[PDB]
Amino acid sequence: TVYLPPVPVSKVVSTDEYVARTNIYYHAGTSRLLAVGHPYFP
Amino acid sequence: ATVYLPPVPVSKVVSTDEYVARTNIYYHAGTSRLLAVGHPYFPIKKPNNNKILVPKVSGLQYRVFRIHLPDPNKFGFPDTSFYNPDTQRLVWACVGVEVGRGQPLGVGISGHPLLNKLDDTENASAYAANAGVDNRECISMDYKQTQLCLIGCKPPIGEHWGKGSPCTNVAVNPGDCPPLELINTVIQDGDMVDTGFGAMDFTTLQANKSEVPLDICTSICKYPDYIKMVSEPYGDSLFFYLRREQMFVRHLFNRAGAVGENVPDDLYIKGSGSTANLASSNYFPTPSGSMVTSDAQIFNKPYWLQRAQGHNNGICWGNQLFVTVVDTTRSTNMSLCAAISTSETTYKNTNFKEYLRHGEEYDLQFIFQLCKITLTADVMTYIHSMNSTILEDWNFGLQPPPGGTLEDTYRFVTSQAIACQKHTPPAPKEDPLKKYTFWEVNLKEKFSADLDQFPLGRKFLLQAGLKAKPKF
Amino acid sequence: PTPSGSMVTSDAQIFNKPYWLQRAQGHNNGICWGNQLFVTVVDTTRSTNMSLCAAISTSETTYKNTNFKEYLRHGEEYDLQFIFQLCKITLTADVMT
Amino acid sequence: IKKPNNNKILVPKVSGLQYRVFRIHLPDPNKFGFPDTSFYNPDTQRLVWACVGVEVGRGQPLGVGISGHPLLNKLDDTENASAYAANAGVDNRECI
Amino acid sequence: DGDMVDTGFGAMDFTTLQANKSEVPLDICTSICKYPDYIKMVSEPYGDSLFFYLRREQMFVRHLFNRAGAVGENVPDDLYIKGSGSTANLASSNYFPTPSGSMVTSDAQIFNKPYWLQRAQGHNNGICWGNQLFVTVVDTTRSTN
Amino acid sequence: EDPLKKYTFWEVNLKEKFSADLDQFPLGRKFLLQAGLKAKPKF
């Protein structure tokens, strides 16, 4: 009952509030990734 | 004569959802987090002193959680007008519960440096030798994997075997078999899960002290009795729970020592030579934990509670709420070493002391629902019937002394250096269970009025539906 | 062969869960004649044998296997709760017969 | 367990491996007065109990027992043998 | 990057707290194995740490050993009965298990399958601020040497 | 009376223990819950 009686306006909001979704979509991607190296020590 | 049946005494404990009313309001509070450190096998203390240097901690130790709530009837809200503080009260209802666990998942272990053992009974190419003196060995094993959860407004009731008073006819000689007790008791923190050796006191019934690994040797492993618990009239022990456990066999051994009772010969045929002596008859299995999985984890998942086995529906009387949680999954024991001498470059076992410390990670996030109680004739009775103390922290606002008045408090002005007695101003004690020690947390400061800002709650949203709360 | 029990689980427990009889392979439907009803239950899951030891002499601090007698006792725990429905029978001769 | 000379049992043999039978009497309901008994005629009829549903409570913590014998008829391990076994003696039984 | 998964020895620095340097296999000996705290992470008000994840792991016991060296702290005698001769000396109390990977299956693979994300635990819904997007992926399945 | 009296085995007598209300018992209310129709007095 200590900390509750004051309350001012605060509230992170769900990003979907202000954000708007458009009609367009895209893609991109790497070709591929490849790495080689010894397991135990460099 | 016996059973041909008129009579009807009982007034029938009823489902709490009868008189309780559910409000529109919901709240949350949660701890930041909890973790505990410690040594798994035994507590650390100064050798001469009785004071503990390090507390004994392991996941194998049980965990109790007591949680206080502030009295909601001291609170104030936006719309507090919706009720009358005179004819009514306010009580918290516990809608849903979460158990946070962040440790990376891995298995611990235990053993004992002197373990009563004869030999390996799984395969023997020849009859064993004769029992010497103190054949006990350094051997370890893993405990059964287990997960369980307990929630309610009354402390969890466990049970164990124990030694009671033998009926007095035959005089007990040293080494006789003591008789063996079913005992209920309150569950205390720091107590130990069963190892698959069953809930009892080894200290009393096991004189060898070597029959089990360290961690449990002194303590009393106990086990929750669902039956006795659930069959409470009010269910207020626990209104909900879950359980998971599994085990399988690994090794097969013999107790080593003087045979307490010989097998009747007719159960076998007498041997001779090496076969003249009967090998130790006692076998005990080696319990072995199995592969843990991410899947069977019972934590990190929300649990909604509406209907329960008991008539209590998530009602916390006396601003009080209980959580009992036990898991072996995180039992991992990190080992570390320090160097007493950092100079020499030739490795020497004498240079490194070895230590064992253990992590314990808990988190709590609680939904709560708000509830009011109208007072009427039966109402007060029914509660006063149920438990009267619960009432007492309310106003009632009855009465106070129509149970009775204190006749007077003799208050009599003396420097105490008169010859007149001691008088010490009394009455702190509010806890009947204060004898029982266990883990403590205070939420009282932590409530908030908006679930949006919390990770857990918006699931409350998502499940129930809607946002913010005031949008159809 | 050497038969071997496998890993027990909390899941496959057949107890501590209600049952609901509607149909029975026989024509008898849950009728207990002669006020008489039978239950046969067998399980190995709780077979745990607690071992204990007593000391014939509590004095010496040097342990000796001769000092302790060994005993084996074993727990068992059952519970029963039965619903019952009440039933009447009319008569005629055929039935009586 | 029994007194060694006597035939009377000191302790009864008990293990989970033992079967368990449960016999349950009920009192004859036709003797049992109902809050209203009027819905039937005790002359022309009777009353018999029907068993709708059943439960089995078990409270022990779950764990596996075990058994063996100090003299067990055995020759050798047949899972792996690097050489032919020996010749059978007298009373090779083992504790397993 | 380059940091090490837990081996079942827990997230810490062995270099600092283990002087012996021999208490674990090479790969982790120098580095600090770390582990993600979902709690801490999800406690972000935004979730902008992570708005999504999945996890799978399993382990079982294999062998049981002893640390070899000077006892750091003796066990209180009252926890046992003093031996004699060979039994006069208490063998090393410290045990450590041997973690063991289990059978992999094609099924449990979390990869090579599309994952749609609409609603997330944080108020961030798949929003990438600063033209910036993060992915952290770790697996043991392909570890073949 | 018992023709099987030759057959010894575990015995229990319930005859005293009947009651007319599931509600007071843990198990029963499930019977109610399953078939529904929660009928209880007012308070």
DSSP output for E75-107? PPGGGS----GGGGSPPP--EEEEEE-----ST
- A3, B70 in Cβ contact below 8 A? no
B21: which strand partners? B372
Give CA–CA dist E131/B150, Å, rounded. 46
Residues in B closer than 8 angstroms to F21, CB to CB, are: 12
Q: For residue B435, what are its two tokens?
A: 């004898």
Residue E57's H or E segment, with its range, is none
Tell whether E46 lies on the interface with A, counting CB pairs under 8 A: yes
**Alpha carbon of B163: minimum distance to chain A alpha carbons (Å):** 49
**Alpha carbon of A31: minimum distance to chain B alpha carbons (Å):** 33
Give CA–CA dist B91/B70, Å, rounded. 10
Of B252, B250, B317, the residue nearest B279 (C-alpha): B252
Residues in D closer than 8 angstroms to C3, CB to CB, are: none
Which chain B residue has the Cα nearest residue F31? B309
Give CA–CA dist B14/B311, Å, rounded. 6
How many helices, marked H, and strands, marked E, lie in chain E?
3, 3
| Spatial CB neighbours of A14, under 8 Å, sequence gap ≥ 6 | B452, B467, E123, E125
Give CA–CA dist E10/E13, Å, rounded. 9
Neighbours of B427 (CB within 10 A): 5
F2, F8, F12, best to mutate vs chain D, most D CBs in 10 Å: F12
Q: Which of D23, D52, D59 sits opposite C38 (nearest CB)?
A: D23
Per-residue DSSP letter, B174: T
Tell whether C19 lies on the interface with F, counting CB pairs under 8 A: no
CB pairs under 8 A between B and F: 39
Give CA–CA dist B139/B369, Å, rounded. 52
From the centroid of its chain, how far is CA E94?
20
Query: B392-426 b/e with 16+ CB inside 10 Å = b?
Result: eebeeeeeeeeeeeeeeeeeeeeeeeeeeeeeeee
Residues in D closer than 8 angstroms to F15, CB to CB, are: 25-27
Give CA–CA dist F26/B263, Å, rounded. 45
Q: Which of A12, A15, A41 sits opposite E125 (nearest CB)?
A: A15
Q: Phi first, then psi: what are they for B35, rounded to 5°?
A: -155, 155
Q: What is the dihedral of CA B343, B349, B353, B355, to 10 degrees?
A: 130
Give CA–CA dist D28/D46, Å, rounded. 10
From the centroid of its chain, how far is CA C83?
19
| Spatial CB neighbours of C53, under 8 Å, sequence gap ≥ 6 | B116, B205, B206, B207, B208, B211, B255, B257, C68, C69, C70, C71
- B60, B143 in Cβ contact below 8 A? yes
Q: Give rounded-to-5 percent helix, strand, coil for chain F.
A: 30, 5, 65
**Alpha carbon of A27: minimum distance to chain E alpha carbons (Å):** 14
Task: Determine, for residues B447 and A11 on separate chains, whether the beta-carbon distance falls below 8 Å.
Answer: no
Task: Determine, for residues C66 and B133 on separate chains, whether the beta-carbon distance falls below 8 Å.
Answer: yes
Residues in C closer than 8 angstroms to E82, CB to CB, are: 61-63
| Spatial CB neighbours of F6, under 8 Å, sequence gap ≥ 6 | none
What three-state secondary structure class fits E135?
coil
Tell whether B12 lies on the interface with F, counting CB pairs under 8 A: yes
List helix spans (H) across B38-81.
none
Neighbours of D22 (CB within 10 A): 16
Per-residue DSSP letter, B230: H
Q: Give me the resolution in angstroms, 1 decimal.
A: 4.3
- B232, E102 in Cβ contact below 8 A? no
Q: What is the dihedral of CA B99, B105, B107, B108, to 10 degrees?
A: -70
> What is the 3-state secondary structure of B301-344?
CCEECCCCCCCCCCECHHHEEEEEEEECCCCCCEEEEEECCCCC
The count of residues in chain B is: 472
Q: Experimental method for this entry? A: cryo-EM
Cα–Cα distances in angstroms (integers) from residue D8 to residues B179, D2, D3, D18, E35, in the given order = 19, 6, 6, 20, 65
Of B112, B351, B39, the residue nearest E92 (C-alpha): B112
From the centroid of its chain, how far is CA B213?
21
Neighbours of B303 (CB within 10 A): 16
Per-residue DSSP letter, B206: B
Dmax (CA) for chain D in angstroms is 87
Q: Phi first, then psi: what are they for E55, rounded to 5°?
A: -150, 140
Give CA–CA dist D39/B179, Å, rounded. 54
Task: Determine, for residues A3 and B70 on separate chains, whether the beta-carbon distance falls below 8 Å.
Answer: no
Starting at the edge strand found earlier in the chain, the sheet holding E70-71 runs: B334-339, B352-357, E70-71
CB pairs under 8 A between B and C: 112
Cis upstream peptide for B400 (omega within 30°) = yes
- C78, C42 in Cβ contact below 8 A? no
Q: In this structure, is the dihedral angle defined by the CA atoms of residues B221, B225, B228 and B234, taken in order, positive or negative?
A: positive
- B94, B305 in Cβ contact below 8 A? yes
Q: Which of D76, D91, D96 sits opposite B121 (nearest CB)?
A: D96
Q: In this structure, is the dihedral angle defined by the CA atoms of residues B171, B172, B176 and B178, taken in order, positive or negative?
A: positive
Q: Which of D26, D35, D53 sits opposite F14 (nearest CB)?
A: D26
Are F and B touching by the rule of 3+ CB pairs within 8 Å? Answer: yes
- B161, B204 in Cβ contact below 8 A? no
- For D1-61, list the strands marked E by DSSP: 20-25, 46-50, 54-57
Q: For residue B238, what are its two tokens?
A: 């626990």
Residues in F closer than 8 angstroms to B239, CB to CB, are: none
Q: Which of F12, F25, F34 sits opposite C20 (nearest CB)?
A: F34
Give CA–CA dist B222/B64, Å, rounded. 14
Q: For residue D52, what are its two tokens?
A: 């709708």
Cα–Cα distances in angstroms (integers) from residue B121 to residues B140, B262, B293, E75, E137, in the given order = 17, 19, 32, 30, 47
- B249, C5 in Cβ contact below 8 A? yes
Which chains are within 8 Å of E by 3+ CB pairs? A, B, C
How many helices, marked H, and strands, marked E, lie in chain B?
6, 23
The count of residues in chain F is: 43
B141: which strand partners? B110
Residue B238's H or E segment, with its range, is none
From the centroid of its chain, how far is CA B89?
31
How many helices, marked H, and strands, marked E, lie in chain F?
1, 1
Q: Phi first, then psi: what are they for B61, rounded to 5°?
A: -65, 140
Give CA–CA dist B31/B67, Å, rounded. 11
- B112, B209 in Cβ contact below 8 A? no
Give CA–CA dist E115/E122, Å, rounded. 18
Which chain B residue has the Cα nearest residue A10? B453
Residue bearing tokens 């000379």: D5
CA angle D11, D16, D17 (to 5 degrees): 100
Give CA–CA dist B274/E11, Å, rounded. 54
B339: which strand partners? B352
- B29, B446 in Cβ contact below 8 A? yes
Q: For residue B62, what are its two tokens?
A: 């049980």
Which chains are within 8 Å of D by 3+ CB pairs? B, C, F
Residue A10's H or E segment, with its range, is none
CA angle C43, C45, C47 (to 5 degrees): 90
Give CA–CA dist F29/F40, Å, rounded. 11
How many helices, marked H, and strands, marked E, lie in chain A?
0, 0
Q: For residue E23, what are its two tokens?
A: 């208490």
List helix spans (H) across B185-284.
202-205, 214-217, 226-230
Cis upstream peptide for B397 (omega within 30°) = yes
CA angle B280, B284, B288 (to 5 degrees): 150
- A3, B447 in Cβ contact below 8 A? yes
Give CA–CA dist B329/B145, Å, rounded. 7
Residue F35's H or E segment, with its range, is helix F28-35
Task: Determine, for residues A39 and E145 on separate chains, whether the beta-carbon distance falls below 8 Å.
Answer: yes
| Spatial CB neighbours of E144, under 8 Å, sequence gap ≥ 6 | none
Query: E64-74 b/e with 16+ CB inside 10 Å = b?
Result: eebbebbebbe
Q: For residue E87, what are its two tokens?
A: 């039994």
Q: What is the dihedral of CA E58, E63, E67, E68, to 10 degrees?
A: -150
Residue bearing tokens 């007012």: F42
**Burial class (CB within 10 angstroms; exposed 0-12, middle 13-18, buried 19+) of E47:** buried
**Alpha carbon of B396: minimum distance to chain A alpha carbons (Å):** 20
Q: For residue B280, what are its two tokens?
A: 């130790």
Task: Determine, for residues C68 and B284 on separate chains, whether the beta-carbon distance falls below 8 Å.
Answer: no
Residues in E closer than 8 angstroms to C61, CB to CB, are: 81-82
Neighbours of B177 (CB within 10 A): 20
Give CA–CA dist C73/C65, Å, rounded. 20
Task: Determine, for residues E125 and A12 on separate chains, whether the beta-carbon distance falls below 8 Å.
Answer: no
Rg (CA), chain A: 25
Tell whether B319 lies on the interface with E, counting CB pairs under 8 A: no
Cα–Cα distances in angstroms (integers) from residue B355 to residues B42, B299, B337, E68, E92, in the given order = 12, 30, 6, 12, 11
What three-state secondary structure class fits B73?
helix
Q: For residue E50, what are its two tokens?
A: 């992570």
Tell whether D12 lies on the interface with C, counting CB pairs under 8 A: no
D55: amino acid identity, one letter: E
DSSP output for B388-416? HHHHHTS-----STTS------------S
Give CA–CA dist E62/B257, Å, rounded. 30
- F41, F24 in Cβ contact below 8 A? no
Q: Which of D24, D28, D50 sits opposite C30 (nearest CB)?
A: D50
Q: What is the dihedral of CA D25, D29, D34, D38, to 10 degrees?
A: 170
How far the first Cα of chain A sits from its last, in Å, is 59
